[PDB]
Write a protein that binds this DNA or RNA. Structure first.
Ligand SMILES: Nc1ncnc2c1ncn2[C@@H]1O[C@H](COP(=O)(O)OP(=O)(O)OP(O)(O)=S)[C@@H](O)[C@H]1O
Ligand SMILES: Nc1ncnc2c1ncn2[C@@H]1O[C@H](COP(=O)(O)OP(=O)(O)OP(O)(O)=S)[C@@H](O)[C@H]1O
Ligand SMILES: [Mg+2]
Ligand SMILES: [Mg+2]
Lengths: 277, 271, 277, 277, 278, 276, 277
DNA sequence: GGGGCTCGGCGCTC
DNA sequence: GAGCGCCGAGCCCC
């Protein structure tokens, strides 16, 4: 393994070591942590691209040493779980907190195999986007499926940890790729103006107001892809309209909820409609 | 053949040797095998392009010694088969194990000619992507026909050993091009932001839940004459595990020692 | 004017070596001497020099020989009844002497406006076998890009034989095609090049769907029938070859074309090749 | 990971200066010191440094600075009578040392839910003179486009102060305004952009009308008066200003705060302000 | 603040100062003022971008952050102003040369408050086109009120050191906005394909052969806004016709005129019609 | 602000050269000197230098030079050998009278009579005279009267304008009376903002009466006198020989050079007095 | 002004060489010398000098050299019995010397309005073998592209010879067609370019029908035949050539158009070329 | 759905 | 290395 030993090489190695230690995975965090370093590294033209390269290398080295559970699950219990917004929404909706929390934990770790996405389906103003945002932002680098663009939808989901599909239906053009990335199957997807890369199994969380198991194409809907999708989804149907002035789901709430999940884990039947009784 | 002799050329010849001798083909594998090596080569633009050049050259060098049959057949015997998972998948549906195994083995060596594509077709949760992914990852290089991007579909199938068309449907924009790769025909395909390149014959696995020998029917006969068809129809359980990267080798290697003549046909005969 | 420097000496040695060995693509270059390719890829001027060397060597070989030099053979044929092209053309009916004369004429650019041979027939009859044998008997051969629309006839520039594998005559490229398939000069697009030009070269189409009927969206306009038929001969193959029949090796192509030059006979300018003997 | 060099030192000094002056775009730089702008904008190595420096100044100021930093002046003030707003306070009775103390607590967010200001009085009463000066002072300032019902608070994101000129309250934005007017974190919809969170930003309002009255079509309701009376102060500037008093210069703003920080007095948490008897 | 000091920096500073001073907003004027400098700076690839950057900076620095009189009052004093055509144009129409010139200076300096306009009125070929052009072209940046375009009549009136309302015909749709501008009051105007911009107090000059006090609204004419309008403009009615060989006025002459004004100012009033020397 | 250096000095020399010899496109450069162009195109540095030199020279000659290049530098001892002289002499026009008028037309000396209308049948030297003189000055325009929308599109910043086979039309009569009147007038340009045309002497070769405004199937002479107050008409009736040849750029310069040395008074008449 | 160094001298030598041997594309460069071309691709400087050299040589030729300057070869001609054009002409009824003289006049622009020569006759008569021989014997040439009705002559600008290979004449460009065929300047519209003037250039036409036919929508009118026949010296190929007749080499064309000048004969301006000595 | 529209990341050339 | 520039792949509007 040749190891370049120039001055630029030494500076770059030190920078990426510091970045991987301090968990910095974006400029914003850098400028929040050490202002002098960033201002200095923007003071030329060699280092301007070196910044982007360093951030990408830090992202790669973190993604290959820490998976989703490392960040999500917390390190201390809560000792009183009712203020958690997540628990209150999943309780008032009807599901019991134990089984609902076991399913979430078994979805961060991929213990469930093909079922690699949790589908939140509820009328407007129920919590879908809130929980999705919390679980998506609690990780270093998440991914959003650009459902508007139909020729390169999963373009930012290369080398990520948690994918989040915010809205939209399952068009007849993205069903073929969705069945691959939702199913946690290693494939090689198309990259804009570049060659293909590999998408390792990444858990997904889809929030929508309209059904995804019946593909929709313009003025016609299809049902041949209803079993293959329904066998790779959990379907949390959240109905009760969330009261006004309900606190933004704060990262610490997500960490504590998942920690309580790991504390009271209970086995969950491997089915589509998550048991609610 | 002028051999450039300098410092940079020697270092590059040292990097490509290390890459080939360690089976490294992608950056991720480079990081896993050695971290300081990769973190160094992103420093300057020279090395940043040298990384891509070295990976491509290592890929080419590995291919010009080997082929698919040299990776998919293990170096040790089986001594027990009923525990295997490809065997179980093929036995549940009724297919005689060794007949279909001979079909697979011949499909790997290109012994059948124009018919070098296995089409696994069946209802949901039957065991198609399992076998397909096991076979595709047992080999170092594998392509995947792009579903979207109907202008450069077969861009990732230029110098690969085993193609894997996942959840594919035959649209009229790919039929005329899929009539070349699925038949091992030596043709020059279009690449992106690069000059056209040549595709040597390559086996192809197709796993589709919908009929794939009909364009959406004038191309039914020419398409169903370059693919076998294994109609898997038994719903599996969730305890049934993944086809490990080592079970494929055991299956194909148990095949090489019990090969049987396979009747050239579109519908692989049950029983 | 001969630029005499060290780099010019290296380049001249490289091009002379390539022409003496017969390399026309990078893959063969590696396959002959790996050290050469790896070294000439190391540096930053590397890629430019490799691309220029390949293009220049191909140009030299193309100017120093033509299609008949490669296709025709220097040794005679003891008995042609074994060669598979003869059997393909005899099962269907065509008298092999007449068809051999037609093939030899098309190779040597001698029939004027009918500069192409069209093979058409139901599935598994023998089209692609003959086409690929002929195409690979010549060191250089082009192929039309089926899907790409912004650069359709790329890779057909300065080749010896053009091989349209399974093409369909789309309305986008009907004019440029009506000109390339006619032994004339056309203005074609290219990648990162300034509107290069196509020399008049033989073309061998092997589509199993009608090639003289243009398709417009979901419509088929027969307007362009006469312009296309007046510049192509047609071999209507019907018989169904069986497996374990083998592919036409290059030696067979050379032997057949040689057996033509020694037995040539006249042929009328007719779209439908005279079906009999 | 600090780049020590000449260009690095110059860039650090420049961006520190920029964040010190709150300069964001060039035009402001020109107005502050033209010679620096020129001297930088000559060579090709500097014409990119300027853009990068403006971007870095913007980011540093946004992510690590608040309004009271750019408002509170530096040099101590010996006289405040000459202060123009002071006169606009004394002339209209409002005790300067008290009425001035009102803003500072609003500047430093010391009044929590009462994190907004409303200047009251007829036209030609310096309201927009006291707003614009206390609306342009901060580096990034937002203006409430109450006329645009869809996106009234579009420009209030990533700011340090929010301007409301001739503000009129409508029932459609009353719920949105109360969150903004109360200094509470809230998310607003941006045109052609995702919803963004408006962090507590001391807002300023100028309207000769009554901000406690909600206008809904042809009906006006006071149901949100007290809710709107608990979120902001109110100064009635009856005395019209002379035609020669002019505007309020930035210096006349800052010096007032530097004087309003050295003469602090206890302020009340009431809706209205008290006038010096 | 930071200032870079290098060999290139000194030359660039000199160039931008020279540009802001001479009034060289664009290249072509650079050619017309010193061809040697342009033919020189165009030589290499390090100067062929220096030119464009210098022009951008100069246009910006001048158009903003500087006052219009700064290129209407010259430097070298004027001994004999009678030779100046304007002195002849005003003298020809019985306009006391010293009074109007004093009125001219005040209008440029905004000293005449809301009366921020000069309306050269009368038939054609009476100096109205000559003066306006000579004065409008004099300043670095100027615009022409596009009254014909109702949507954005004042699109090109932003950051214009002088506004020339050529053959103006004020309409009912622009009367309100015109009064604020004609009054020199800060007003926001809509720009085509751009956000609304504010027009700081900016002088005007109106040349027309129709009465501006009349509001043209379709087939009806109303003088309702007559009094406010006449409180925002002066009236230098020019009736005498000029000779065919009179010729155009030069910025050299215009400079002299407005320079003579500063040396021959006199007390002035704020009525609507300029008094003619009896 | 003067940048001085070897490159700057050579560039200034080249641009003085180009502005002196009236060069505005590469083709003309190869014609006047192929060796210079071949030499310059060698290095990758000088390509941009050539492009900049050509554009800058064109702009300079546009904005700081006048049309009377028509006057040569060296004196003309003999002018009898000039085709233009022979043409004018052959057409009953006194060489010192029509040359003097010609000169006053180049210098705009006539105020309003800004154009020289060449009249007569084909092959009488009209087109040659216009094509010869017009190709003399660096920049010149062609009146595209066939294009009603933008007939004077190519008449902006032109040292000389040509109206080849012109035909007055009602739509363009007002604009044409403005141009031929040597008066500044703004014209509409295709895909460009309206531009002003400064006074530019004009030369016309036609066989139709320009004083006859054409409007569909009707012809009106209402604009006769105003147009007749804007032209210096010439009637070239004699037919030229086949081997007469074109007028060389050296001849046109020689002709006007003789005129400058033999200036005589001219009368602003709609008909140039022939030599009795 | 003239730059002088070693680089300038080398480029001057190269451009002189190209203009002497009449080169306008790489292929010809390799044909006339190989070590020259291979040398100039080594470095990037040479690979950029090649394009400029070809452009400048092409220009200088199109400006200062005319059609006869290359059609009439530079070396003497001894035997004129063998030349393929000579044999073809003697195989129809034309005196070879007289036909050579008429072609020469068509080259040196001698017959005035009759500035075109027309190759008429049935298929397989060798129209291509002639036109493509002459048209290849001048540095540049163009092909009348009637498929582009907007700019049929867009490829016939600054050409020393023009090839009317195929396509009929449209009514919309009859005047321009007469101008081109009549050796008269004419401004033609160019695609994506300003109108360009086509100087008097000889034209060569290859037709199996009457090109005088003029298409006006659905109407084909011969009213323009007489104006055209006064503008064209026509040749009417009598019968079919032998397919083994060979190809008229460039050297054969040079020999023909050199022996023509050495033995010019008087011509008569009839529409047809006299069929005798 | 078929035309043009600029745009982005890259190469390549200086 | 700067920068420069181009260009194809890609994108959007009518
Ligand atoms: N990552 C995994 N972990 C555990 N089991 C897995 C995993 N991936 C697949 N399986 C098993 O694979 C079995 C069948 O899955 P698949 O092979 O994907 O079926 P399939 O035929 O491909 O379904 P489709 O809809 O046709 S793609 C399931 O019963 C799972 O137990
Ligand atoms: N930043 C925030 N501050 C305060 N409340 C918030 C914030 N973000 C979300 N909420 C609350 O989140 C609750 C539920 O919002 P959502 O989950 O977005 O409802 P939703 O309709 O399921 O989302 P959609 O349909 O995907 S837009 C609302 O009642 C808000 O009060
Ligand atoms: Mg699958
Ligand atoms: Mg085929």
């Amino acid at each position: 393994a040749p190891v370049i030993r120039s001055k630029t090489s030494a500076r770059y190695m030190e920078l990426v070591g510091w970045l991987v230690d301090k968990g910095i995975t974006s400029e914003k965090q850098w400028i929040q942590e050490d202002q002098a370093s960033y201002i200095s590294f923007n003071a030329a033209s060699n280092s301007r691209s070196q910044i982007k390269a360093a951030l990408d290398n830090a992202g790669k080295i973190m993604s290959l040493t820490k998976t989703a559970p490392d960040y999500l699950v917390g390190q201390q219990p809560v000792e009183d779980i009712s203020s958690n917004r997540i628990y209150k929404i999943l309780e008032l909706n009807g599901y019991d907190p134990q089984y609902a929390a076991s399913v979430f934990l078994g979805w961060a770790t991929k213990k469930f195999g093909k079922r690699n996405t949790i589908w939140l389906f509820g009328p407007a103003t129920t919590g879908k986007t809130n929980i999705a945002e919390a679980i998506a932002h609690t990780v270093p680098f998440y991914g959003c499926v650009n459902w508007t663009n139909e020729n390169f939808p999963f373009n930012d989901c290369v080398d990520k940890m948690v994918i989040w599909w915010e809205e939209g239906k399952m068009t007849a053009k993205v069903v073929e790729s969705a069945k691959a990335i939702l199913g946690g199957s290693k494939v090689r997807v198309d990259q804009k103006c570049k060659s293909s890369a590999q998408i390792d199994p990444t858990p997904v969380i889809v929030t929508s107001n309209t059904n995804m198991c019946a593909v929709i194409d313009g003025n016609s809907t299809t049902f041949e892809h209803q079993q293959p999708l329904q066998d790779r989804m959990f379907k949390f149907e959240l109905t009760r309209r969330l009261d006004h002035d309900f606190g933004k789901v704060t990262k610490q709430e997500v960490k504590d909820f998942f920690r309580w999940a790991k504390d009271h884990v209970v086995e969950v039947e491997h089915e589509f409609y998550v048991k609610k009784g």
